[PDB]
């Protein structure tokens, strides 16, 4: 029983680590796209609402 519980806990920790790495990769992609959008909109004209 003690061996089975230990195996289950390791398997959960690996899944949690993988999910965290994916989320950090997606957040970096989005941050890069925001930076690239900000460099291209520096030509021509303001108005309004």
Automatic annotation (TrEMBL):
Record's superkingdom? Eukaryota
Question: Of which family is this protein a member?
Answer: Belongs to the TRAFAC class dynamin-like GTPase superfamily. GB1/RHD3 GTPase family.
Recorded protein name is: Guanylate binding protein 1
The taxonomic lineage of its organism, from the top, reads: Eukaryota, Metazoa, Chordata, Craniata, Vertebrata
